[PDB]
Enzyme design. Structure first.
Site, short mmCIF file in Angstrom:
data_model
loop_
_atom_site.label_atom_id
_atom_site.label_comp_id
_atom_site.label_asym_id
_atom_site.label_seq_id
_atom_site.Cartn_x
_atom_site.Cartn_y
_atom_site.Cartn_z
N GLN B 15 0.82 -1.21 0.00
CA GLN B 15 0.00 0.00 0.00
C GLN B 15 0.86 1.26 0.00
O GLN B 15 0.47 2.28 -0.58
CB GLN B 15 -0.95 0.00 1.20
CG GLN B 15 -2.02 -1.09 1.11
CD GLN B 15 -3.09 -0.98 2.18
OE1 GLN B 15 -4.24 -1.35 1.95
NE2 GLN B 15 -2.71 -0.48 3.35
N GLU B 254 26.28 8.74 -1.85
CA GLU B 254 27.26 9.64 -1.25
C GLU B 254 26.85 9.99 0.18
O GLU B 254 27.69 10.02 1.07
CB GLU B 254 27.40 10.92 -2.09
CG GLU B 254 28.83 11.19 -2.53
CD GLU B 254 28.98 12.53 -3.23
OE1 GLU B 254 29.46 12.54 -4.38
OE2 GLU B 254 28.62 13.56 -2.63
N1 GTP Z 1 2.10 3.11 7.50
C1 GTP Z 1 1.38 2.03 7.20
N2 GTP Z 1 1.41 0.93 8.02
C2 GTP Z 1 0.68 -0.17 7.71
C3 GTP Z 1 -0.10 -0.20 6.56
N3 GTP Z 1 -0.71 -1.40 6.51
C4 GTP Z 1 -0.34 -2.13 7.58
N4 GTP Z 1 0.52 -1.37 8.35
C5 GTP Z 1 1.17 -1.78 9.60
O1 GTP Z 1 1.71 -3.07 9.45
C6 GTP Z 1 1.59 -3.81 10.65
C7 GTP Z 1 0.97 -5.17 10.37
O2 GTP Z 1 1.63 -5.77 9.28
P1 GTP Z 1 0.93 -5.96 7.84
O3 GTP Z 1 1.78 -5.36 6.75
O4 GTP Z 1 -0.45 -5.37 7.84
O5 GTP Z 1 0.80 -7.57 7.71
P2 GTP Z 1 1.48 -8.41 6.51
O6 GTP Z 1 2.84 -7.87 6.15
O7 GTP Z 1 0.56 -8.41 5.31
O8 GTP Z 1 1.64 -9.91 7.06
P3 GTP Z 1 0.37 -10.81 7.46
O9 GTP Z 1 0.31 -10.91 8.97
O10 GTP Z 1 0.56 -12.19 6.88
O11 GTP Z 1 -0.89 -10.19 6.93
C8 GTP Z 1 0.73 -3.00 11.60
O12 GTP Z 1 1.52 -2.49 12.65
C9 GTP Z 1 0.18 -1.87 10.75
O13 GTP Z 1 0.09 -0.67 11.49
C10 GTP Z 1 -0.12 0.91 5.72
O14 GTP Z 1 -0.81 0.90 4.70
N5 GTP Z 1 0.62 2.02 6.05
#
Ligand code: GTP
Ligand code: GTP
Ligand code: 89U
Ligand code: CA
Ligand code: MG
Ligand code: MG
Lengths: 421, 440, 67
Positions: B15, B254
């Site tokens: 995302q 750099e």
């Molecule tokens: N900044 C930001 N953080 C995100 C976003 N989506 C998820 N997170 C953070 O990612 C963490 C959870 O990991 P995810 O990336 O959602 O999970 P995953 O990598 O898909 O791994 P799975 O557990 O298998 O779903 C949480 O602490 C969320 O706050 C996003 O779109 N932007």
């Protein structure tokens, strides 16, 4: 998608099972014919979780109806949304269990179990990616209690890497006059602690007290108790059924709710029985728990809460923070951020907004102590013990189930007394 | 040449990838279908934007990127989204079952089933490079995929590409938007496993970004969309030197020379400015001096910590837009005599400066005001170790009771990996403490 | 001097290959140990369920041997 296979065993299981399918069929906007007549696409985003899409856009519940007596089977087929269930998924014996756990688990049910597994297997094999099963039953009877726990062991054999969830209805003398219930419960609990990943403790003692004292309903019917169960079951499956930040995954719930494998017995709660502050205070109140336990008699290991309806998300965050701070003593400190909140824009039927609660509290021991007390009272006299040995059981298996549940209680006590330092 | 391949892992990585690549396209005048009218060399080229975009004979500019997630619903939104034509279908890789917030499932059980396919698709991109520079890996610390699969990938990439540079953009967990109680476990495990395989990692504290969206943009309850559009600006500022040219343009490598004094000390603190709403930016011009001084306001940092209570080992200023060295030097001279900026005794105190004349861009319907000049400060401060300290403490609280550990053991892991991981973090906190001590 | 120059670049190659080599082996070791463990956990689980079947057979047997 991520399919869940529903199973309902015994009278109690089929009753609340049928009600569960009635309520969510309405929420997802599908009629008892299986056709969609909704307005929002959000109703069909994750419909595959509980439904199979047949020809002509016909949504059929992925449910298996089980009982050792054909009586209730006709009730469902005649009742509302009886035409939506798959006919072949109706698996019925002819000889009831007669509130005998041994009959359901070793004798009668052990003869019908294979034909059930054949239906389970047929449903499962058609799933894109099966995630697990959910069982609705009581622990006080014979079929849903004895055979239900048999199915669990059998299903876990063929699907050991799948999640096994259960909606177990706990027995209470306030509702059922049957005397041997504390035997069937203790024997069931002995199984659930070993072979289930998540068990929602639906307690009739709690359901009775709510209808009577809160809803002001003297002499409550099963329809009244089930109206509470249906609203509860609808709530704890909302995120499994609707689009949200976190998607429908039984495993993710288990991972975050179960810090230790045996301690997987949740006490659910519901509100109301308004403004955001009101909902939050109520859902954490003992009067709103579907398990006859005072949360202030123990500590929360983990908590999951679902608010439903259109409301201020800023306010929900603030009030949930407020409760944890004002009641910090009732949350274990050695699990940071152990309370998580979810929000579904779509409210239930009849309510502008509601709040469902899922707590993993050490206060659940109060429920197991109640059953253990009623159990040992029967077992010291060996009352009606012949109904069990008559099916080939031993006195030990009664003793083992007792002490195992005693361990569960003390283990809940261990982590209640635990400190960070 | 000097191509850069981006790898977006898990929901957060993906995302954020959507935000970054949308922003890139707008900065380069690339359309959603991939066509770039201003680009006259059809089918190829050695321009600066080619470091991030390849070219097809039909004139489509394709991101040098791979999107990976063990569950399809997030990447499916890319496949059917506004910029679906931008990516070749093979660039978007999905499994059927996620890691369930479990590092073990991301690294082992589920991850191993798809790791070979991912590496193959990454190889197809690299073979199109005439001089591959390295990789940019976007992922969360808390997710099972973001943690587990990323670390597996980083290990495999070091084998298949040796010492080819690998940079991280890592999302540090925050309770306001956290999705799992076990994110501290996943965080410590991925940090330990990845540490030897990463050359430079930019941590993004979600709480820091959450606060900035609330404070500076007046968003009552920021969404991932709000966070990601802000993050992409920081990422854009960091990659701007790679995607654009200019006399005063300084290559990221750099800055990297200055930012990493020892291999393990490769976590720069990012600070960005100006973050301001359209309402407040109207009839309000933030000068070079104002945005530069804002870099030393801790409230503007990507990670929550106090550099004023730590020591600097490097200070880099990455300007973009209407900016000239004269004003920069004046702003720095002022700041040095009013701010709490103290360097370790083994490092020179000079600020390293880079300027890209390409002005800041904003996405339509965004919250950020379009300004004429922005700045991203990259500093190497001992204070970043505070972020490790907070995570390691939350790790300790749960691990003392072995809470949730059975979910990891059940998937093949051992408690030895937990203790091994935590010890490496303790050594890392000690490392950041040692580098701050005065020389003998 | 030419000799030293050769030794430097050879050392660089050696260290790089050694890093790749150790990374390759360390990983293969981890996935193997993980495969063993997870299997051992699933195997034990099935064995306990296997004992439940054996027990149920002994229960049903015990019934007809009391008639
Ligand atoms: N900044 C930001 N953080 C995100 C976003 N989506 C998820 N997170 C953070 O990612 C963490 C959870 O990991 P995810 O990336 O959602 O999970 P995953 O990598 O898909 O791994 P799975 O557990 O298998 O779903 C949480 O602490 C969320 O706050 C996003 O779109 N932007
Ligand atoms: N809440 C609720 N509890 C029920 C309902 N029906 C039965 N029970 C409870 O279930 C317990 C007995 O189990 P049952 O489900 O009735 O019996 P069974 O599972 O069919 O097993 P057998 O009748 O012996 O074949 C009693 O304690 C009842 O209070 C119901 O519709 N709602
Ligand atoms: C206690 O910590 C947590 C507990 C549960 C979850 C995840 C869930 C959850 C995860 C997947 C599916 C459904 C649910 C829910 O229906 C739910 C409802 C409200 C809040 C969280 C949860 C996430 C956590 O971080
Ligand atoms: Ca070109
Ligand atoms: Mg009955
Ligand atoms: Mg995910």
């Amino acid at each position: 998608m991520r399919e869940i296979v529903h199973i309902q065993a015994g009278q109690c299981g089929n009753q609340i099972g049928a009600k569960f399918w009635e309520v969510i069929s309405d929420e997802h906007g599908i009629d008892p014919t299986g056709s969609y007549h909704g307005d929002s696409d959000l109703q069909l985003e994750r419909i595959n979780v509980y439904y199979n899409e047949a020809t002509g856009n016909k949504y059929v519940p992925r449910a298996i109806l089980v009982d050792l007596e054909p009586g209730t089977m006709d009730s469902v087929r005649s009742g509302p949304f009886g035409q939506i269930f798959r006919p072949d998924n109706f698996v019925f014996g002819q000889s009831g269990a007669g509130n005998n756990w041994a009959k359901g688990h070793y004798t009668e049910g052990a003869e019908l179990v294979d034909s059930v597994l054949d239906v389970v297997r047929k449903e499962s094999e058609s799933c894109d990616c099966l995630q697990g099963f959910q069982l609705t039953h009581s622990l006080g009877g014979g079929t849903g209690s004895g055979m239900g726990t048999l199915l669990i062991s059998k299903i876990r054999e063929e699907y050991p890497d799948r999640i096994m969830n259960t909606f177990s209805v706990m027995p209470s003398p306030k509702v059922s006059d049957t005397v041997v219930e504390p035997y069937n419960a203790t024997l069931s609990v002995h199984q659930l602690v070993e072979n289930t990943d998540e068990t929602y403790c639906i307690d009739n003692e709690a359901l009775y007290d709510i209808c009577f004292r809160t809803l002001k309903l003297t002499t409550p019917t099963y329809g009244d108790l089930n109206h509470l169960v249906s609203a509860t079951m609808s709530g704890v499956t909302t995120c499994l059924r609707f689009p949200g930040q976190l998607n429908a995954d039984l495993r993710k719930l288990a991972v975050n709710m179960v810090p230790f494998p045996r301690l997987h017995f949740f006490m659910p709660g519901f509100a109301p029985l308004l403004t955001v502050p009101e909902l939050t205070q109520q859902m954490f109140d003992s009067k709103n728990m579907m398990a006859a336990c005072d949360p202030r008699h123990g500590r929360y290991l983990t908590v999951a809460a679902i608010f439903r309806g259109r409301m201020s998300m800023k306010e929900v965050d603030e009030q949930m923070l407020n409760v944890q701070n004002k009641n910090s003593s009732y949350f274990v400190e050695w699990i940071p951020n152990n309370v998580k909140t979810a929000v579904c824009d779509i409210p239930p039927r009849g309510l502008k907004m509601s709040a469902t609660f899922i707590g993993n509290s050490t206060a659940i021991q109060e429920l197991f102590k109640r059953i253990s007390e009623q159990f040992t009272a029967m077992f010291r006299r060996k009352a009606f013990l012949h109904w069990y040995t008559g099916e080939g059981m031993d006195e030990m298996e009664f003793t083992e189930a007792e002490s195992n549940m005693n361990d569960l209680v003390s283990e809940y006590q261990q982590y209640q007394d635990a400190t960070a330092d | 040449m000097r191509e850069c391949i981006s790898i977006h892992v898990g929901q957060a990585g993906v995302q954020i990838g959507n935000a970054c690549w949308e922003l890139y396209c707008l900065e380069h005048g690339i359309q959603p279908d991939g066509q770039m009218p201003s680009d006259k060399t059809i089918g190829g080229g050695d321009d600066s934007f080619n470091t991030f975009f390849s070219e097809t004979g039909a004139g489509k500019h394709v991101p040098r990127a791979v999107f990976v997630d063990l569950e399809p619903t997030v990447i499916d939104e890319v496949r059917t989204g506004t910029y679906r034509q931008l990516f070749h279908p093979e660039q978007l890789i999905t499994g059927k079952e996620d890691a369930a917030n479990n590092y073990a499932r991301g690294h082992y059980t589920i991850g191993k089933e798809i790791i070979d396919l991912v590496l193959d698709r990454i190889r197809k991109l690299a073979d199109q490079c005439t001089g591959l520079q390295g990789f940019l890996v976007f992922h969360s610390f808390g997710g099972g995929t973001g943690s587990g699969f990323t670390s597996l990938l980083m290990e495999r990439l070091s084998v298949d590409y040796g010492k080819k540079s690998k940079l991280e953009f890592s999302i540090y967990p925050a309770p306001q938007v956290s999705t799992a109680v076990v994110e501290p476990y996943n965080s410590i495990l991925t940090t330990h496993t990845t540490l030897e395989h990463s050359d430079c990692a930019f941590m993004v504290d979600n709480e820091a970004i959450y606060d900035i969206c609330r404070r500076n943009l007046d968003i009552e309850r920021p969404t991932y969309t709000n966070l990601n559009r802000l993050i992409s600006q920081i990422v854009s500022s960091i990659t701007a030197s790679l995607r654009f040219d200019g006399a005063l343009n300084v290559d990221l490598t750099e800055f990297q020379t200055n930012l990493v004094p020892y291999p393990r000390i490769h976590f720069p603190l990012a600070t960005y400015a100006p973050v301001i709403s359209a309402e407040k930016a109207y009839h309000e011009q933030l000068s070079v001096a104002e945005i530069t001084n804002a870099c030393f306001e801790p409230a503007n940092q990507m990670v929550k910590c106090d550099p004023r209570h730590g020591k600097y080992m490097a200070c880099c200023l990455l300007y973009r837009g209407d900016v000239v060295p004269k004003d920069v030097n004046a702003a720095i001279a002022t700041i040095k005599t009013k701010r709490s900026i103290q360097f370790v005794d083994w490092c020179p105190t000079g600020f390293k400066v880079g300027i890209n004349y390409q002005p800041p861009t904003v996405v339509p319907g965004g919250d950020l005001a379009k300004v004429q000049r922005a700045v991203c400060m990259l500093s190497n401060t001992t204070a970043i170790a505070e972020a490790w300290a907070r995570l390691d403490h939350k790790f300790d609280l749960m691990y003392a009771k072995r809470a949730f550990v059975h979910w990891y053991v059940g998937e093949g892991m051992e408690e030895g990996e937990f203790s091994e991981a935590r010890e490496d973090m303790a050594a890392l906190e000690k490392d950041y403490e040692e580098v701050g001590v005065d020389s003998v | 001097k030419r000799e030293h120059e050769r030794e430097v670049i050879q050392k660089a190659i050696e260290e790089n290959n050694n890093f790749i080599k150790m990374a390759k082996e360390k990983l293969a070791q981890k996935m193997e140990s993980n495969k063993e463990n997870r299997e051992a956990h699933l195997a034990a689980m099935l064995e306990r369920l296997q004992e439940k079947d054996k027990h149920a057979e002994e229960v049903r047997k015990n019934k007809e041997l009391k008639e």
